[PDB]
Coordinates of N, CA and C in Angstrom, one line a residue:
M1 N 30.1 -6.6 -11.7 CA 28.7 -6.6 -12.1 C 27.8 -7.3 -11.1
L2 N 26.5 -7.1 -11.3 CA 25.5 -7.7 -10.4 C 24.9 -9.0 -11.0
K3 N 24.7 -10.0 -10.2 CA 24.2 -11.3 -10.6 C 23.1 -11.8 -9.7
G4 N 22.0 -12.3 -10.3 CA 20.9 -12.8 -9.6 C 20.1 -13.8 -10.4
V5 N 18.7 -13.7 -10.3 CA 17.9 -14.6 -11.0 C 17.3 -14.1 -12.3
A6 N 17.6 -14.7 -13.4 CA 17.1 -14.3 -14.7 C 15.6 -14.5 -14.8
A7 N 14.8 -13.5 -14.3 CA 13.4 -13.6 -14.3 C 12.8 -13.6 -15.7
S8 N 13.4 -12.9 -16.6 CA 13.1 -12.9 -18.0 C 14.3 -12.7 -18.9
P9 N 14.4 -13.4 -20.0 CA 15.5 -13.3 -20.9 C 15.4 -12.0 -21.8
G10 N 16.5 -11.6 -22.4 CA 16.5 -10.5 -23.3 C 17.6 -9.4 -22.8
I11 N 17.7 -8.4 -23.7 CA 18.7 -7.3 -23.4 C 17.9 -6.0 -23.4
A12 N 18.0 -5.2 -22.3 CA 17.5 -3.9 -22.2 C 18.5 -2.9 -21.8
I13 N 18.5 -1.7 -22.5 CA 19.5 -0.7 -22.2 C 18.8 0.7 -22.1
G14 N 19.1 1.4 -21.0 CA 18.7 2.7 -20.8 C 18.8 3.1 -19.3
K15 N 17.9 4.1 -18.9 CA 18.0 4.6 -17.6 C 17.5 3.7 -16.5
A16 N 17.9 3.8 -15.3 CA 17.3 3.1 -14.2 C 16.9 4.1 -13.1
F17 N 15.8 3.8 -12.4 CA 15.3 4.7 -11.4 C 15.1 3.9 -10.1
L18 N 15.5 4.5 -8.9 CA 15.4 3.8 -7.7 C 14.2 4.2 -6.9
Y19 N 13.3 3.2 -6.6 CA 12.1 3.4 -5.8 C 12.5 3.8 -4.4
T20 N 12.0 4.9 -3.9 CA 12.1 5.3 -2.5 C 10.8 5.5 -1.8
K21 N 10.7 4.9 -0.7 CA 9.4 4.9 0.1 C 9.6 5.4 1.5
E22 N 8.8 6.4 1.9 CA 8.9 6.9 3.2 C 8.7 5.8 4.3
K23 N 9.6 5.9 5.3 CA 9.5 4.9 6.4 C 8.1 4.9 7.0
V24 N 7.6 3.6 7.1 CA 6.3 3.4 7.7 C 6.3 3.2 9.2
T25 N 6.2 4.3 10.0 CA 6.1 4.1 11.4 C 4.6 4.1 11.9
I26 N 4.2 3.0 12.4 CA 2.8 2.8 12.8 C 2.6 3.1 14.3
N27 N 1.7 4.0 14.6 CA 1.4 4.4 16.0 C 0.2 3.7 16.6
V28 N 0.5 2.7 17.4 CA -0.5 1.9 18.0 C -0.7 2.1 19.5
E29 N -0.2 3.3 19.9 CA -0.3 3.7 21.3 C -1.8 4.0 21.8
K30 N -2.1 3.5 22.9 CA -3.5 3.8 23.5 C -3.7 5.3 23.7
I31 N -4.9 5.7 23.4 CA -5.2 7.1 23.3 C -6.3 7.5 24.3
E32 N -6.5 8.8 24.6 CA -7.6 9.2 25.4 C -9.0 9.0 24.7
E33 N -10.0 8.7 25.6 CA -11.3 8.3 25.1 C -12.0 9.4 24.3
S34 N -11.5 10.6 24.5 CA -12.0 11.8 23.8 C -11.5 11.8 22.3
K35 N -10.5 11.0 22.0 CA -9.9 11.0 20.7 C -10.4 9.8 19.9
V36 N -11.4 9.1 20.4 CA -12.0 8.0 19.7 C -12.6 8.5 18.4
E37 N -13.4 9.5 18.5 CA -14.1 10.1 17.3 C -13.1 10.7 16.3
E38 N -12.0 11.2 16.9 CA -10.9 11.7 16.0 C -10.3 10.7 15.1
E39 N -10.0 9.5 15.7 CA -9.4 8.4 15.0 C -10.4 7.8 14.0
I40 N -11.6 7.7 14.4 CA -12.7 7.2 13.5 C -12.8 8.2 12.3
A41 N -12.9 9.5 12.5 CA -13.0 10.4 11.4 C -11.8 10.3 10.5
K42 N -10.6 10.2 11.0 CA -9.4 10.0 10.2 C -9.4 8.7 9.4
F43 N -9.9 7.7 10.1 CA -10.1 6.4 9.4 C -11.0 6.5 8.2
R44 N -12.1 7.1 8.3 CA -13.1 7.3 7.2 C -12.5 8.1 6.1
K45 N -11.7 9.1 6.5 CA -11.0 9.9 5.5 C -9.9 9.1 4.8
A46 N -9.2 8.3 5.5 CA -8.2 7.4 4.9 C -8.9 6.4 4.0
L47 N -10.1 6.0 4.3 CA -10.8 5.1 3.4 C -11.1 5.8 2.1
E48 N -11.5 7.0 2.1 CA -11.7 7.8 0.9 C -10.5 7.9 0.1
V49 N -9.3 8.2 0.7 CA -8.0 8.2 0.1 C -7.7 6.8 -0.5
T50 N -8.0 5.8 0.3 CA -7.7 4.4 -0.1 C -8.5 4.0 -1.3
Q51 N -9.7 4.4 -1.4 CA -10.6 4.2 -2.5 C -10.0 4.8 -3.8
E52 N -9.6 6.1 -3.6 CA -8.9 6.8 -4.7 C -7.7 6.1 -5.2
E53 N -6.8 5.7 -4.2 CA -5.6 5.0 -4.5 C -5.9 3.8 -5.3
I54 N -6.7 2.9 -4.8 CA -7.0 1.6 -5.4 C -7.6 1.8 -6.8
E55 N -8.6 2.7 -6.9 CA -9.3 3.0 -8.2 C -8.3 3.4 -9.2
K56 N -7.4 4.4 -8.9 CA -6.4 4.9 -9.9 C -5.4 3.8 -10.3
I57 N -5.1 2.9 -9.3 CA -4.2 1.8 -9.6 C -4.9 0.8 -10.5
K58 N -6.2 0.5 -10.2 CA -7.0 -0.3 -11.1 C -7.0 0.1 -12.5
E59 N -7.2 1.4 -12.7 CA -7.1 2.0 -14.1 C -5.9 1.7 -14.8
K60 N -4.7 1.9 -14.1 CA -3.4 1.7 -14.7 C -3.3 0.2 -15.0
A61 N -3.7 -0.7 -14.1 CA -3.6 -2.1 -14.3 C -4.5 -2.6 -15.4
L62 N -5.7 -2.0 -15.5 CA -6.6 -2.4 -16.6 C -6.1 -2.0 -18.0
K63 N -5.5 -0.8 -18.1 CA -5.1 -0.3 -19.4 C -3.8 -1.0 -19.8
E64 N -3.0 -1.4 -18.9 CA -1.6 -1.9 -19.2 C -1.6 -3.4 -19.2
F65 N -2.3 -4.0 -18.2 CA -2.3 -5.4 -18.0 C -3.6 -6.1 -18.4
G66 N -4.7 -5.4 -18.1 CA -6.0 -5.9 -18.4 C -6.8 -6.3 -17.2
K67 N -8.0 -6.9 -17.4 CA -8.8 -7.2 -16.2 C -8.2 -8.2 -15.3
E68 N -7.2 -9.0 -15.8 CA -6.5 -10.0 -15.0 C -6.0 -9.3 -13.7
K69 N -5.5 -8.1 -13.8 CA -5.0 -7.4 -12.7 C -6.0 -6.4 -12.1
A70 N -6.9 -5.8 -12.9 CA -7.8 -4.8 -12.5 C -8.9 -5.4 -11.6
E71 N -9.3 -6.7 -11.9 CA -10.3 -7.4 -11.1 C -9.8 -7.6 -9.7
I72 N -8.5 -7.9 -9.6 CA -7.8 -8.0 -8.3 C -7.9 -6.8 -7.5
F73 N -7.7 -5.6 -8.1 CA -7.8 -4.3 -7.4 C -9.3 -3.9 -7.1
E74 N -10.2 -4.5 -7.9 CA -11.6 -4.3 -7.7 C -12.0 -5.1 -6.4
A75 N -11.4 -6.2 -6.2 CA -11.5 -6.9 -4.9 C -11.0 -6.1 -3.8
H76 N -9.8 -5.5 -4.0 CA -9.2 -4.7 -3.0 C -10.1 -3.5 -2.6
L77 N -10.7 -2.9 -3.7 CA -11.6 -1.8 -3.5 C -12.8 -2.2 -2.6
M78 N -13.4 -3.4 -2.9 CA -14.5 -3.9 -2.2 C -14.2 -4.2 -0.7
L79 N -13.0 -4.7 -0.5 CA -12.5 -4.9 0.8 C -12.3 -3.6 1.6
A80 N -11.8 -2.5 0.9 CA -11.6 -1.2 1.5 C -13.0 -0.6 1.8
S81 N -14.0 -0.9 1.0 CA -15.3 -0.4 1.1 C -16.2 -1.3 1.9
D82 N -15.7 -2.4 2.4 CA -16.5 -3.4 3.1 C -17.0 -2.9 4.4
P83 N -18.3 -2.7 4.5 CA -18.9 -2.2 5.7 C -18.5 -3.0 7.0
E84 N -18.3 -4.3 6.8 CA -18.0 -5.1 7.9 C -16.6 -4.8 8.5
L85 N -15.6 -4.6 7.6 CA -14.3 -4.2 8.0 C -14.2 -2.8 8.5
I86 N -15.0 -1.9 7.9 CA -15.1 -0.5 8.3 C -15.6 -0.4 9.7
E87 N -16.7 -1.0 10.0 CA -17.4 -0.9 11.3 C -16.5 -1.7 12.3
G88 N -15.9 -2.8 11.9 CA -15.0 -3.5 12.8 C -13.9 -2.7 13.4
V89 N -13.3 -1.9 12.5 CA -12.2 -1.0 12.9 C -12.7 0.1 13.8
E90 N -13.8 0.7 13.4 CA -14.4 1.9 14.2 C -14.8 1.4 15.6
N91 N -15.4 0.2 15.7 CA -15.7 -0.4 17.0 C -14.5 -0.7 17.8
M92 N -13.4 -1.2 17.1 CA -12.2 -1.5 17.8 C -11.6 -0.2 18.4
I93 N -11.6 0.9 17.7 CA -11.1 2.2 18.2 C -11.8 2.5 19.5
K94 N -13.1 2.5 19.5 CA -13.9 2.9 20.6 C -13.8 1.9 21.8
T95 N -13.8 0.6 21.4 CA -13.8 -0.4 22.4 C -12.6 -0.4 23.2
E96 N -11.4 -0.3 22.5 CA -10.1 -0.5 23.2 C -9.5 0.9 23.4
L97 N -10.1 1.9 22.9 CA -9.7 3.3 23.1 C -8.3 3.5 22.4
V98 N -8.1 2.9 21.2 CA -6.8 2.9 20.6 C -6.9 3.7 19.3
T99 N -5.7 3.8 18.6 CA -5.6 4.5 17.3 C -6.3 3.7 16.2
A100 N -6.6 4.4 15.1 CA -7.0 3.8 13.9 C -5.9 2.9 13.3
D101 N -4.7 3.3 13.5 CA -3.6 2.4 13.1 C -3.6 1.1 13.8
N102 N -3.8 1.1 15.2 CA -3.9 -0.1 16.0 C -5.1 -0.9 15.6
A103 N -6.3 -0.2 15.4 CA -7.5 -0.9 15.1 C -7.5 -1.6 13.8
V104 N -7.0 -0.9 12.8 CA -6.9 -1.5 11.4 C -6.0 -2.7 11.4
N105 N -4.8 -2.5 12.1 CA -3.8 -3.5 12.2 C -4.4 -4.8 12.8
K106 N -5.1 -4.7 13.9 CA -5.6 -5.8 14.6 C -6.7 -6.5 13.9
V107 N -7.7 -5.7 13.4 CA -8.9 -6.2 12.7 C -8.5 -6.9 11.4
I108 N -7.6 -6.3 10.7 CA -7.1 -6.9 9.4 C -6.3 -8.1 9.7
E109 N -5.4 -8.1 10.6 CA -4.6 -9.2 11.0 C -5.5 -10.4 11.5
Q110 N -6.5 -10.1 12.3 CA -7.3 -11.1 12.9 C -8.1 -11.9 11.8
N111 N -8.8 -11.1 10.9 CA -9.6 -11.7 9.9 C -8.8 -12.5 8.9
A112 N -7.6 -11.9 8.6 CA -6.7 -12.6 7.6 C -6.2 -13.9 8.2
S113 N -5.8 -13.9 9.5 CA -5.3 -15.1 10.2 C -6.3 -16.2 10.3
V114 N -7.6 -15.8 10.4 CA -8.6 -16.8 10.3 C -8.7 -17.5 9.0
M115 N -8.7 -16.8 7.9 CA -8.8 -17.3 6.6 C -7.5 -18.2 6.3
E116 N -6.4 -17.8 6.8 CA -5.2 -18.6 6.7 C -5.2 -19.8 7.5
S117 N -5.8 -19.7 8.7 CA -5.8 -20.8 9.7 C -6.8 -21.9 9.2
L118 N -7.7 -21.6 8.3 CA -8.6 -22.5 7.7 C -7.9 -23.4 6.7
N119 N -6.6 -23.1 6.4 CA -5.8 -23.9 5.5 C -6.4 -24.1 4.1
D120 N -7.1 -23.0 3.7 CA -7.6 -23.0 2.3 C -6.8 -22.0 1.5
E121 N -6.1 -22.6 0.5 CA -5.2 -21.8 -0.3 C -5.8 -20.7 -1.0
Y122 N -7.1 -20.8 -1.4 CA -7.9 -19.8 -1.9 C -8.1 -18.6 -1.0
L123 N -8.5 -18.9 0.3 CA -8.7 -17.9 1.3 C -7.4 -17.3 1.8
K124 N -6.3 -18.0 1.6 CA -5.0 -17.5 1.9 C -4.7 -16.4 0.9
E125 N -4.9 -16.6 -0.3 CA -4.8 -15.6 -1.3 C -5.6 -14.4 -1.0
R126 N -6.9 -14.6 -0.6 CA -7.8 -13.6 -0.2 C -7.3 -12.9 1.0
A127 N -6.7 -13.6 1.9 CA -6.1 -13.0 3.1 C -5.0 -12.1 2.8
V128 N -4.2 -12.4 1.8 CA -3.1 -11.5 1.3 C -3.7 -10.2 0.7
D129 N -4.8 -10.4 0.0 CA -5.5 -9.2 -0.5 C -6.0 -8.3 0.6
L130 N -6.6 -9.0 1.7 CA -7.0 -8.2 2.9 C -5.9 -7.5 3.6
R131 N -4.7 -8.3 3.7 CA -3.6 -7.7 4.4 C -3.1 -6.5 3.6
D132 N -3.0 -6.5 2.3 CA -2.6 -5.4 1.5 C -3.4 -4.2 1.7
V133 N -4.7 -4.4 1.6 CA -5.7 -3.3 1.8 C -5.5 -2.6 3.2
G134 N -5.4 -3.4 4.2 CA -5.3 -2.9 5.6 C -4.0 -2.1 5.7
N135 N -2.9 -2.6 5.2 CA -1.6 -1.9 5.2 C -1.7 -0.6 4.6
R136 N -2.3 -0.5 3.4 CA -2.4 0.7 2.6 C -3.3 1.8 3.3
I137 N -4.3 1.3 4.0 CA -5.1 2.2 4.8 C -4.3 2.8 5.9
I138 N -3.5 2.0 6.6 CA -2.6 2.5 7.7 C -1.6 3.5 7.1
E139 N -1.0 3.2 6.0 CA -0.1 4.1 5.3 C -0.7 5.4 4.9
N140 N -2.0 5.4 4.5 CA -2.8 6.6 4.2 C -3.1 7.4 5.4
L141 N -3.3 6.7 6.5 CA -3.4 7.3 7.8 C -2.1 8.0 8.2
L142 N -1.0 7.4 8.0 CA 0.3 7.9 8.3 C 0.7 9.0 7.3
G143 N 0.2 8.9 6.1 CA 0.6 9.8 5.0 C 1.9 9.4 4.4
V144 N 2.1 8.1 4.2 CA 3.4 7.6 3.6 C 3.4 7.9 2.2
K145 N 4.5 8.7 1.8 CA 4.7 9.0 0.4 C 5.8 8.2 -0.2
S146 N 5.9 8.1 -1.5 CA 6.9 7.4 -2.2 C 7.1 7.9 -3.7
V147 N 8.1 7.4 -4.4 CA 8.4 7.8 -5.7 C 7.4 7.2 -6.7
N148 N 6.7 8.1 -7.5 CA 5.8 7.6 -8.4 C 6.4 7.2 -9.7
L149 N 7.1 6.0 -9.7 CA 7.8 5.5 -10.9 C 6.9 5.2 -12.0
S150 N 5.6 4.9 -11.7 CA 4.6 4.5 -12.7 C 4.2 5.7 -13.5
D151 N 4.5 6.9 -13.1 CA 4.2 8.1 -13.8 C 5.3 8.6 -14.7
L152 N 6.3 7.8 -14.8 CA 7.4 8.1 -15.7 C 7.1 7.7 -17.1
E153 N 7.4 8.6 -18.1 CA 7.1 8.5 -19.5 C 8.4 8.1 -20.3
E154 N 9.2 7.3 -19.8 CA 10.4 6.8 -20.5 C 10.8 5.4 -20.1
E155 N 11.3 4.7 -21.1 CA 11.8 3.3 -20.8 C 12.9 3.3 -19.8
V156 N 12.5 2.9 -18.6 CA 13.5 2.8 -17.5 C 13.5 1.5 -16.8
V157 N 14.6 1.2 -16.1 CA 14.7 0.0 -15.3 C 14.1 0.2 -13.9
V158 N 13.3 -0.7 -13.4 CA 12.7 -0.6 -12.1 C 13.6 -1.2 -11.0
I159 N 14.2 -0.3 -10.2 CA 15.1 -0.7 -9.1 C 14.4 -0.5 -7.8
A160 N 14.2 -1.5 -7.0 CA 13.6 -1.4 -5.7 C 14.0 -2.6 -4.8
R161 N 13.9 -2.4 -3.5 CA 14.3 -3.3 -2.5 C 13.2 -4.5 -2.4
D162 N 12.0 -4.1 -2.4 CA 10.9 -5.0 -2.3 C 9.6 -4.5 -2.9
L163 N 9.1 -5.1 -3.9 CA 7.9 -4.8 -4.6 C 6.9 -5.9 -4.6
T164 N 5.6 -5.6 -4.6 CA 4.6 -6.7 -4.7 C 3.9 -6.5 -6.1
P165 N 3.2 -7.6 -6.5 CA 2.5 -7.6 -7.8 C 1.5 -6.4 -7.8
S166 N 1.0 -6.0 -6.6 CA 0.0 -4.9 -6.5 C 0.7 -3.6 -6.8
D167 N 2.0 -3.5 -6.7 CA 2.7 -2.3 -7.0 C 3.2 -2.3 -8.4
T168 N 3.7 -3.4 -8.9 CA 4.3 -3.5 -10.2 C 3.2 -3.5 -11.3
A169 N 1.9 -3.7 -10.9 CA 0.8 -3.7 -11.9 C 0.4 -2.2 -12.2
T170 N 1.1 -1.3 -11.6 CA 0.9 0.1 -11.9 C 1.9 0.6 -13.0
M171 N 2.9 -0.2 -13.3 CA 4.0 0.2 -14.2 C 3.5 0.0 -15.6
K172 N 3.7 1.0 -16.4 CA 3.4 1.0 -17.8 C 4.3 0.1 -18.6
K173 N 3.7 -0.9 -19.4 CA 4.4 -1.8 -20.1 C 5.6 -1.2 -20.9
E174 N 5.3 -0.2 -21.7 CA 6.2 0.4 -22.6 C 7.2 1.3 -22.0
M175 N 7.0 1.5 -20.7 CA 7.9 2.5 -20.0 C 8.8 1.7 -19.0
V176 N 8.8 0.4 -19.1 CA 9.7 -0.5 -18.3 C 10.7 -1.3 -19.1
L177 N 12.0 -1.1 -18.9 CA 13.0 -1.9 -19.5 C 13.1 -3.3 -18.9
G178 N 12.9 -3.3 -17.6 CA 13.1 -4.6 -16.8 C 13.0 -4.3 -15.3
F179 N 13.1 -5.4 -14.5 CA 13.0 -5.3 -13.1 C 14.2 -5.8 -12.4
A180 N 14.6 -5.2 -11.3 CA 15.7 -5.7 -10.5 C 15.5 -5.4 -9.0
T181 N 15.6 -6.4 -8.1 CA 15.2 -6.3 -6.7 C 16.3 -6.8 -5.8
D182 N 16.3 -6.3 -4.6 CA 17.2 -6.8 -3.5 C 16.8 -8.2 -3.1
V183 N 15.5 -8.5 -3.1 CA 15.0 -9.7 -2.6 C 14.3 -10.6 -3.6
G184 N 14.1 -11.9 -3.3 CA 13.5 -12.8 -4.2 C 12.1 -13.2 -3.8
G185 N 11.5 -12.3 -3.0 CA 10.2 -12.6 -2.3 C 9.1 -12.7 -3.3
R186 N 9.3 -12.1 -4.5 CA 8.3 -12.2 -5.5 C 8.9 -12.6 -6.9
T187 N 10.0 -13.4 -6.8 CA 10.7 -13.7 -8.0 C 9.8 -14.3 -9.1
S188 N 8.9 -15.2 -8.7 CA 8.1 -16.0 -9.6 C 7.1 -15.0 -10.3
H189 N 6.7 -14.0 -9.6 CA 5.7 -13.0 -10.1 C 6.4 -12.0 -11.1
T190 N 7.6 -11.7 -10.8 CA 8.4 -10.8 -11.7 C 8.8 -11.6 -12.9
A191 N 9.0 -12.9 -12.8 CA 9.3 -13.8 -13.9 C 8.1 -13.8 -14.9
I192 N 6.9 -14.1 -14.4 CA 5.7 -14.2 -15.2 C 5.4 -12.9 -15.8
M193 N 5.4 -11.8 -15.0 CA 5.1 -10.5 -15.4 C 6.0 -10.0 -16.5
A194 N 7.3 -10.0 -16.2 CA 8.3 -9.5 -17.2 C 8.2 -10.2 -18.5
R195 N 7.9 -11.5 -18.5 CA 7.8 -12.3 -19.7 C 6.6 -11.9 -20.5
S196 N 5.5 -11.7 -19.8 CA 4.2 -11.2 -20.4 C 4.3 -9.8 -20.9
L197 N 5.2 -9.0 -20.4 CA 5.5 -7.7 -20.8 C 6.5 -7.6 -21.9
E198 N 7.1 -8.8 -22.3 CA 8.0 -8.9 -23.4 C 9.3 -8.2 -23.1
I199 N 9.7 -8.2 -21.8 CA 10.9 -7.5 -21.4 C 11.8 -8.4 -20.5
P200 N 13.1 -8.2 -20.5 CA 14.0 -8.9 -19.6 C 13.9 -8.4 -18.2
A201 N 14.3 -9.3 -17.2 CA 14.4 -8.9 -15.8 C 15.3 -9.8 -15.0
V202 N 16.0 -9.2 -14.1 CA 16.9 -10.0 -13.3 C 16.8 -9.5 -11.8
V203 N 16.2 -10.4 -11.0 CA 15.8 -10.0 -9.7 C 16.5 -10.8 -8.6
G204 N 16.4 -10.4 -7.4 CA 17.1 -11.0 -6.2 C 18.6 -10.8 -6.3
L205 N 19.0 -9.6 -6.7 CA 20.4 -9.2 -6.9 C 21.1 -9.1 -5.5
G206 N 20.4 -8.6 -4.6 CA 20.8 -8.5 -3.2 C 20.9 -7.0 -2.7
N207 N 21.6 -6.2 -3.4 CA 21.9 -4.8 -3.0 C 21.8 -3.9 -4.2
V208 N 21.0 -4.2 -5.2 CA 20.9 -3.3 -6.4 C 20.5 -1.9 -6.0
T209 N 19.8 -1.7 -4.9 CA 19.3 -0.4 -4.5 C 20.5 0.4 -4.0
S210 N 21.6 -0.2 -3.6 CA 22.8 0.5 -3.2 C 23.8 0.7 -4.3
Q211 N 23.7 -0.2 -5.3 CA 24.7 -0.2 -6.4 C 24.1 0.6 -7.6
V212 N 22.8 0.7 -7.7 CA 22.1 1.5 -8.8 C 21.3 2.6 -8.2
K213 N 21.5 3.8 -8.7 CA 20.8 5.0 -8.3 C 20.0 5.6 -9.4
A214 N 19.0 6.4 -9.1 CA 18.2 7.0 -10.1 C 19.0 7.9 -11.1
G215 N 18.8 7.6 -12.4 CA 19.5 8.3 -13.4 C 20.7 7.6 -14.0
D216 N 21.1 6.5 -13.3 CA 22.2 5.7 -13.8 C 21.9 4.9 -15.0
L217 N 22.9 4.8 -15.9 CA 22.8 3.9 -17.0 C 22.9 2.4 -16.6
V218 N 21.9 1.6 -17.0 CA 21.9 0.2 -16.6 C 21.6 -0.7 -17.8
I219 N 22.3 -1.8 -17.9 CA 22.0 -2.8 -18.9 C 21.5 -4.1 -18.2
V220 N 20.3 -4.5 -18.6 CA 19.7 -5.7 -18.1 C 19.9 -6.9 -19.0
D221 N 20.7 -7.9 -18.5 CA 21.0 -9.1 -19.3 C 20.4 -10.3 -18.8
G222 N 19.2 -10.6 -19.3 CA 18.4 -11.7 -18.8 C 18.8 -13.0 -19.3
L223 N 19.7 -13.0 -20.3 CA 20.3 -14.2 -20.9 C 21.4 -14.8 -20.0
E224 N 22.2 -13.9 -19.4 CA 23.2 -14.4 -18.5 C 22.6 -14.3 -17.1
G225 N 21.7 -13.4 -16.8 CA 21.1 -13.2 -15.5 C 21.9 -12.2 -14.7
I226 N 22.4 -11.2 -15.4 CA 23.2 -10.2 -14.7 C 22.8 -8.8 -15.0
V227 N 23.2 -7.8 -14.2 CA 22.9 -6.4 -14.4 C 24.1 -5.6 -14.3
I228 N 24.3 -4.7 -15.3 CA 25.5 -3.8 -15.4 C 25.2 -2.4 -15.1
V229 N 25.8 -1.8 -14.1 CA 25.5 -0.4 -13.8 C 26.8 0.5 -14.2
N230 N 26.5 1.6 -14.9 CA 27.6 2.4 -15.4 C 28.5 1.5 -16.4
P231 N 27.9 1.0 -17.4 CA 28.6 0.2 -18.4 C 29.7 1.0 -19.0
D232 N 30.8 0.3 -19.4 CA 31.9 0.9 -20.1 C 31.5 1.2 -21.6
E233 N 32.1 2.1 -22.3 CA 31.8 2.5 -23.6 C 31.7 1.2 -24.5
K234 N 32.7 0.3 -24.4 CA 32.7 -0.9 -25.2 C 31.5 -1.8 -24.8
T235 N 31.3 -1.9 -23.5 CA 30.2 -2.7 -23.0 C 28.8 -2.3 -23.6
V236 N 28.6 -1.0 -23.6 CA 27.4 -0.4 -24.2 C 27.2 -0.8 -25.7
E237 N 28.3 -0.7 -26.5 CA 28.3 -1.0 -27.9 C 28.1 -2.5 -28.1
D238 N 28.7 -3.3 -27.2 CA 28.6 -4.8 -27.3 C 27.2 -5.2 -27.1
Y239 N 26.6 -4.8 -26.0 CA 25.2 -5.1 -25.7 C 24.2 -4.4 -26.7
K240 N 24.6 -3.3 -27.2 CA 23.9 -2.6 -28.2 C 23.6 -3.5 -29.4
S241 N 24.7 -4.0 -30.0 CA 24.6 -4.9 -31.2 C 23.9 -6.2 -30.9
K242 N 24.1 -6.7 -29.6 CA 23.5 -7.9 -29.2 C 22.0 -7.7 -29.0
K243 N 21.6 -6.6 -28.4 CA 20.2 -6.2 -28.2 C 19.5 -6.2 -29.5
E244 N 20.0 -5.6 -30.5 CA 19.4 -5.5 -31.9 C 19.4 -6.9 -32.5
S245 N 20.4 -7.6 -32.3 CA 20.6 -9.0 -32.9 C 19.4 -9.9 -32.4
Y246 N 19.0 -9.7 -31.2 CA 17.9 -10.5 -30.6 C 16.6 -9.9 -30.8
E247 N 16.6 -8.5 -30.8 CA 15.3 -7.8 -30.9 C 14.8 -7.7 -32.3
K248 N 15.7 -7.4 -33.3 CA 15.3 -7.3 -34.7 C 15.2 -8.7 -35.3

């Protein structure tokens, strides 16, 4: 069996799906000066896509989680639409004759590192917001695709190597059995979230992405802090009766 951190107690039984994300290869190679306008055009197009992305995410967050999460994505949207960040990138492209990938990476990193260097925990949180937006812009420039687990209409377990709050806030409350991750980078967030969603979760398993695949039957045991993939017939019935014992 798998063992990790009991982010939230309870028993959940059903399907599990494995989040897959296209490899993010960022091209920061210096380009011909004639391609400056090309990269700027693509950047502005990526901003339009980024606005769509964030907006649609905000909707899901608002409806499922509430303004608590939606307002965060509103901040993300304002960052994406920030004339200062937009012009900064475009000027960076022309000035250094580099890609939009390079420009966004540098501009976003610079401004974020300033807020972090100020040693203000508030601005550090805002720096993370900025970092997230910048990364998603680059991904939209690259055309990075991934599995839309949030569009699933069935109670399933969320299996992934590394998720952020900004990603999990897309997941529909009633369509999530629980969470399980390879890493503990957001353990505390999955703990708070899962509990507020009234569901169990066991995170920081290590290699759940290799042990659990999409379509597999998985039992989430937040009481012991373990996860069972391909449960035995007896195991299913045992946790079945226990699930109802605690649920009902």
